Design a protein around this ligand. Structure first.
Ligand SMILES: C[C@@H]1O[C@@H](O[C@@H]2[C@@H](O)[C@@H](O)[C@@H](CO)O[C@H]2O)[C@@H](O)[C@H](O)[C@@H]1O
Ligand SMILES: CC(=O)N[C@@H]1[C@@H](O)[C@@H](O)[C@@H](CO)O[C@@H]1O
Length: 586
């Protein structure tokens, strides 16, 4: 094993920071990125506390589809990264980079990445110590005849150099199963046997109409737990709103895949945090997002989605490392072996822990994410673990998984009910994680959570998550319900028919909209109410260390009922929020 170029694990998580090449400007002799970020400027902007956990991911986007274009662009940017000087200290501090080397099956009619040989990648790794890895993303819809063979070579060249091969894919058309050899293409299977410690496997939740979110995430987790990948994570994509045909928030009717650039702007900001919790709570540690202009920003500035949701979430997962492999193994009661593609794909989990076929959220944390690996793989390394002795490893073809009802009846024997209410909640140590699981329905949810004898009842609007930690002197609360008003994008359309017929915003138009109406002159959402009721409290709690998104919250209201030893906390806000309540139990 050659020494790893960086650590990627629960204590050293990874936020990929995408920069997409502007191929139009490349044709004009310029080296630029869509949205106006620069490599140096973006890196400089990254808060210093996050720099150790953040890597610039170059993507070749619409560079010309000809030999040399991607190499030229990439070499230019690798040089810029390598030569970077920290202005505050005058020292050369090479910027860490991941290159996107494979996408859309590397077809020459789809991507300039086609013309990036493994020889060239090896050369770049050897020339640039700051090249930490290479990335393959989104080939499920164009599963090239040699994709597994190519993937083996990317993993091997990364292992040769101590870098990581990172692959983001969704289980559409059995993609994840095929990657590991389902249909007899076993080169990557063999590569992973040798080099899994240099592999990161991520979901890519883009193709949302196909509903493969839960099954792909199950596989990512299972592959990690069974030593087929070093770590896992996910790429969470606001284009899901386009893929599923949604339009104005909460509006009825479906417009199909007709208004892409309006659609990728509309997903509520805080919903990205809801998605990211599924990674974190299940031991994943690598995070990436699209569309980058909305999820990260433009012109070397942070979007509000980034500053108020993603940045704060990522800081949280650094301060509170995700559960380790050992911990997740100890907690796992059921591990599935077999192909979801033969058991309804995403339908497998509908009415088990997801509320519908097309969602990136869960409706209960009772089972967490049930880990699985494809049928082609073996569970030998899983069983060799000192931490796997109490796991029931079950074939997906088992009677226990034959129907929705059978799944719950089986899982309920091993995963006890641990809260009440129709809401998502999951407990880790002294922390309850809660969110409203509605996607595009304006419906409040309620739940009853306990910390031993202390009862906490919550009421949440959609697009709201919270983290409630019992601390020695009371409760720490982190709340995020940040959701700006996107109705302006949908003006002039009273119904779905009209919305479908709107003029296209276009890619350039959406970037401009972000600049003119999101980075500045933002149409913030209305403050909305969250309720928290604590029962079993001695005296009126005190509030401490209150902070959050500027101008986004009223002072929380505390109403203590001495006779009933309870307090009702009413919050009116739209943003991230943090505070501690200090109290004793009765
Ligand atoms: C092949 C992929 O292209 C880009 O993503 C596409 C988006 O640009 C958009 O068209 C959505 C629509 O749902 O589909 C995408 O496939 C890249 O961002 C991605 O990394 C792939 O290269
Ligand atoms: C065809 C099309 O619209 N392609 C774009 C692609 O160029 C890139 O901007 C990506 C970002 O998420 O979204 C998509």
């Amino acid at each position: 094993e050659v020494d790893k170029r960086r650590e990627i694990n629960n204590e050293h998580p990874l936020l990929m920071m995408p920069l997409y090449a502007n191929g139009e400007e490349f044709n004009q002799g310029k080296y630029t990125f869509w949205g106006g970020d620069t490599l140096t400027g973006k890196w400089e902007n990254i808060p210093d506390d996050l720099k150790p956990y953040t890597v610039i991911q170059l993507h070749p986007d619409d560079l010309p589809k000809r030999d040399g274009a991607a190499r030229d662009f990439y070499e230019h940017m690798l040089e810029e990264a390598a030569k970077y000087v920290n202005p505050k200290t005058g020292k050369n501090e090479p910027i860490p980079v991941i290159l996107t080397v494979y996408t859309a099956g590397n077809m020459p009619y789809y991507t300039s990445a086609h013309w990036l040989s493994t020889s060239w990648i090896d050369k770049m790794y050897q020339k640039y110590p700051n090249l930490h890895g290479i990335f393959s993303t989104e080939s499920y819809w164009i599963w090239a005849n040699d994709i597994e063979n190519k993937a083996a070579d990317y993993l091997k060249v990364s292992a040769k150099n101590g870098g990581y091969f990172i692959w983001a894919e969704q289980n559409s058309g059995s993609a994840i199963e095929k990657a590991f050899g389902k249909n007899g293409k076993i080169a990557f299977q063999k590569s992973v046997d040798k080099y899994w410690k240099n592999l990161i496997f991520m979901f890519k939740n883009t193709p949302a109409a196909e509903g493969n979110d839960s099954t792909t995430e199950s596989y990512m987790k299972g592959l990690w737990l069974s030593n087929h990948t070093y770590q896992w994570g996910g790429l969470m994509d606001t284009w899901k709103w386009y893929e599923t045909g949604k339009w104005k928030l909460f509006a009825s009717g479906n417009i199909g895949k007709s208004q892409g650039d309006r659609q990728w702007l509309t997903e509520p900001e805080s919903m990205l945090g809801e998605e990211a919790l599924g990674v974190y709570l299940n031991g994943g540690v690598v995070y990436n997002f699209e569309h980058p202009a909305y999820t990260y920003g433009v012109n070397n500035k942070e979007s509000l989605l980034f500053s108020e949701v993603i940045k704060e979430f990522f800081r949280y997962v650094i301060a509170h490392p995700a559960p380790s492999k050992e911990k997740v193994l100890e907690d796992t009661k059921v591990f599935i072996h077999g192909d979801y593609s033969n058991k309804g794909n995403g339908k497998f989990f509908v009415n088990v822990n997801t509320d519908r076929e097309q969602t990136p959220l869960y409706m209960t944390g009772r089972y967490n994410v049930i880990p699985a690996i494809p049928g082609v793989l073996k569970t030998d390394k899983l069983k060799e673990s000192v931490s796997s002795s109490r796991i029931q490893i079950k074939e997906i073809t088992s009677p226990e998984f034959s129907s929705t009802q059978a799944r719950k009846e089986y899982l309920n024997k091993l995963y006890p009910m641990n809260y009440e209410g129709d809401i998502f909640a999951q407990k880790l140590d002294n922390r309850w994680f809660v969110y409203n699981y509605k996607v595009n329905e304006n419906v409040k949810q309620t739940g009853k959570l306990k910390f031993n004898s202390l009862e906490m009842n919550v009421e949440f609007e959609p697009h709201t998550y919270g983290i409630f930690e019992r601390i020695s002197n009371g409760l720490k609360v982190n709340l995020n319900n940040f959701r700006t008003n996107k109705d302006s994008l949908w003006s002039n359309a009273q119904d779905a028919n009209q919305a479908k017929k709107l003029p296209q915003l276009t890619k350039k138009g959406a970037i401009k909209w972000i600049e003119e109406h999101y980075i500045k002159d933002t149409q913030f959402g209305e403050k909305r109410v969250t309720k928290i009721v604590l029962r079993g409290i001695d005296k009126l709690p005190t509030i401490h260390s209150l902070s959050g998104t500027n101008n986004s919250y009223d002072q929380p209201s505390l109403n203590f009922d001495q006779k009933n030893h309870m307090v009702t906390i009413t919050i009116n806000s739209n943003g991230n929020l943090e505070f501690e309540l200090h109290f004793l139990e009765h």
